[PDB]
Design a binder for this molecule. Structure first.
Ligand SMILES: [Cs+]
Ligand SMILES: [Cs+]
Length: 86
């Protein structure tokens, strides 16, 4: 199961790795780690630097991590939900 939406939002981000964010696979996490998005805090940062736009974060995550629709959407929802919480 990839039901890690709950585990990410029931505590703060902190020094959490990128692969801990929902939709960030073990393969995606490598393509993301070499660009300097090694932690889930760095992806949160990019999403805020994009003003939390859904299809701009999803456009960048495709243009960089090589993400698919389910991966890019599950990642955005997890960031949006965590922003909506803390
Ligand atoms: Cs970077
Ligand atoms: Cs809140």
């Amino acid at each position: 199961t990839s039901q890690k939406h709950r585990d990410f939002v029931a505590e703060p981000m902190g020094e959490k790795p990128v692969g801990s964010l929902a939709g960030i696979g073990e393969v995606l996490g490598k393509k993301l780690e070499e660009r300097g998005f090694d932690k889930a805090y760095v992806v949160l940062g990019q999403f805020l630097v994009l003003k939390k736009d859904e299809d701009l974060f999803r456009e960048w995550l495709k243009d960089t991590a090589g993400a698919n629709a389910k991966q890019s959407r599950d990642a955005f929802g997890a960031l949006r939900e965590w922003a909506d919480a803390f």
